[model samples]
Target: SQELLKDYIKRQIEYYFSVDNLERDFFLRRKMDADGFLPITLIASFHRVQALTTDISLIFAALKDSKVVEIVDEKVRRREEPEKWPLPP
Candidate 1:
């Protein structure tokens, strides 16, 4: 179902940018754009994200309420400033 997929993507995206995840997802650190945003397509490249769907529009619409991410144009950034992302445990 679309709603199920949307929520799954939403939650995972939140986790991807969440402080808890950013703290440990070293690979993600290398992927952020120069301006600190990540292209939605890159997100879709993730096995979890892409496995469900390759539709960027679905991903975009799924992220409407992500508390830990901010979206602009086709990119998404963490709500918590990247400078302080992955804060020490």
Candidate 2:
């Protein structure tokens, strides 16, 4: 189940970051230059927003999952790896 969830998340990130979608979506928001590129500042700001929203969703998902929350708490308290750890596959 954990592996499946990891795979799903990985695929989603890939889908959102694809080159064509990136270019099209950026232009959809703001005008592109004659060379077909958004200003570096605009690109960086857009990416920052995307990353924050993505991170928030992942954090909320982990918080909602009791097993994930437990694993995170145990790891933080131990300050070291256990003989076995519940890591995403």
Candidate 3:
């Protein structure tokens, strides 16, 4: 049970990082905003940490975003129905 939970969390983090590109886009936005836009800076900061490392705070932040939350929810649904997930070769 502990192992399964750890594996699921790992897979979820990997999937989120791969699909979202949040960190990459955040830094790109930061690069473009030479003058340091406050709103963009805040939003970018949030996205930038989504997958860098996991903790309760980061998980809460991820779920706070509508897009990221939807993706996680979809993954949970797929996990519930294994037939919906892709099969490894």
Leading candidate by TM-score: 1
lDDT of 2 by residue, 7-85 (tens): 4443443333344454455442234333232232332244534454444445234333333112232121111222222
Which is better, 1 or 3, measured by lDDT? 1
**Cα RMSD of predicted structure 2:** 16.2
TM-score versus the correct structure, for each prediction: 0.84, 0.30, 0.25
Ranking by TM-score: 1, 2, 3
lDDT digits (tens) for residues 1-89 of candidate 3 = 34444444445543433324433444433332222222222322444344344354444344443332223321321122223222222
Better of 1 and 3 by TM-score: 1
Greater-TM-score candidate between 2 and 3: 2
Model 1 alpha-carbon drift over 4 Å, by segment: 86-89
Report lDDT (CA) for all predictions: 0.81, 0.34, 0.34
lDDT of 3: 0.34
**Candidate 3 off by > 4 Å:** 19-89
TM-score of 3: 0.25
TM-score of candidate 2 versus the correct structure, residues matched by position:
0.30
- Candidate 1 lDDT over 1-89, as tens digits, reads 69999999998888888777777887777777655677888888999998788898999989988777888898898876765543222
Q: What TM-score would you give candidate 1 relative to the actual structure?
A: 0.84
